[PDB]
Amino acid sequence: LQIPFAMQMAYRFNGIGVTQNVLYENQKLIANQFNSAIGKIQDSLSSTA
Amino acid sequence: EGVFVSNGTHWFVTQRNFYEPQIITTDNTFVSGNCDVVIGIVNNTVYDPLQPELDS
Ligand SMILES: *[C@@H]1O[C@H](CO)[C@@H](O[C@@H]2O[C@H](CO)[C@@H](O)[C@H](O)[C@H]2NC(C)=O)[C@H](O)[C@H]1NC(C)=O
Ligand SMILES: *[C@@H]1O[C@H](CO)[C@@H](O[C@@H]2O[C@H](CO)[C@@H](O)[C@H](O)[C@H]2NC(C)=O)[C@H](O)[C@H]1NC(C)=O
Ligand SMILES: *[C@@H]1O[C@H](CO)[C@@H](O)[C@H](O)[C@H]1NC(C)=O
C-alpha cells in the first residue's frame, strides 16, 4: 500500500511509545540527523576494513 | 489512533488496516501547537460533541 514517508515515520515513532506530534514538530531536525548518520556510515566503511 | 483520509471532498479519520470512515471530532483527535511548523497540514472542521448539549 503506498504511504507518504513522513506518515510512515509517525507510525514508527508511535510504535516506540512517542506521541506522533514529536516527529512533525521536529521533522527537519530528524531528517538532518538521519541524512548525517547515513553519511557517517560511508566515512566509517571507506576509512576502515 | 488510525489515520486521516479523503475521498476528494470530505475528510475522515479511519483505522490503519481496514477502511471504516469516521467523522472527525475532538474525541478521535488530539492537539499540539499552532499550524505553522507541520509540513503538509490541511484545513477542515473538527466537530465538538459538547455544543448541542450546552445549547439545550
Ligand atoms: C465523500 O464522502 C461523503 C460522505 O459519505 C459524500 O457525501 C455524501 O454524498 C451522498 C451522495 O451524493 C449524499 O446523499 C450525502 O448527503 C452526502 N453527505 C454529505 C455530508 O455531504 C461524498 O459524496 C463523498 N465524495 C465523493 C467524491 O464520493
Ligand atoms: C487555513 O485557514 C487559514 C485561515 O483560517 C488560512 O490562513 C490565511 O492564509 C492566507 C494565504 O496565506 C493569508 O493571506 C491570511 O493572512 C491567513 N490568515 C490567517 C488568520 O493566518 C490558511 O492559509 C489555510 N490553509 C490552507 C492550506 O489553505
Ligand atoms: C508534495 O509535493 C508538491 C509538489 O509536487 C509540493 O508542492 C507539496 O508541498 C508537497 N507536500 C508534502 C506534504 O510534502
Side-chain angles (χ1 to χ4, degrees), chain A, chain B residues 2-26 28-52 54 56:
Chain A
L1 306 175
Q2 74 276 17
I3 188 174
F5 200 75
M7 296 180 67
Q8 172 168 326
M9 277 284 275
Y11 294 5
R12 302 240 177 198
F13 260 63
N14 198 157
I16 64 165
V18 178
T19 306
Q20 297 168 32
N21 71 305
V22 176
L23 176 67
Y24 298 106
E25 293 181 44
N26 297 283
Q27 187 181 323
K28 294 300 196 181
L29 171 61
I30 287 167
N32 285 356
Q33 284 192 354
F34 175 77
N35 292 347
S36 185
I38 293 291
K40 288 170 170 62
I41 304 309
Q42 301 179 268
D43 297 345
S44 180
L45 288 182
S46 185
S47 181
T48 186
Chain B
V3 65
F4 293 125
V5 294
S6 179
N7 67 357
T9 58
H10 294 77
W11 280 101
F12 305 121
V13 64
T14 195
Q15 321 183 42
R16 303 188 202 308
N17 298 300
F18 183 84
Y19 178 56
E20 184 187 50
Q22 304 167 237
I23 310 302
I24 304 170
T25 73
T26 58
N28 53 47
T29 59
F30 75 88
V31 170
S32 184
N34 53 289
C35 317
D36 312 67
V37 177
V38 181
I39 296 158
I41 189 162
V42 306
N43 291 357
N44 202 77
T45 295
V46 173
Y47 173 67
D48 175 9
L50 185 61
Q51 301 302 320
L54 298 179
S56 185

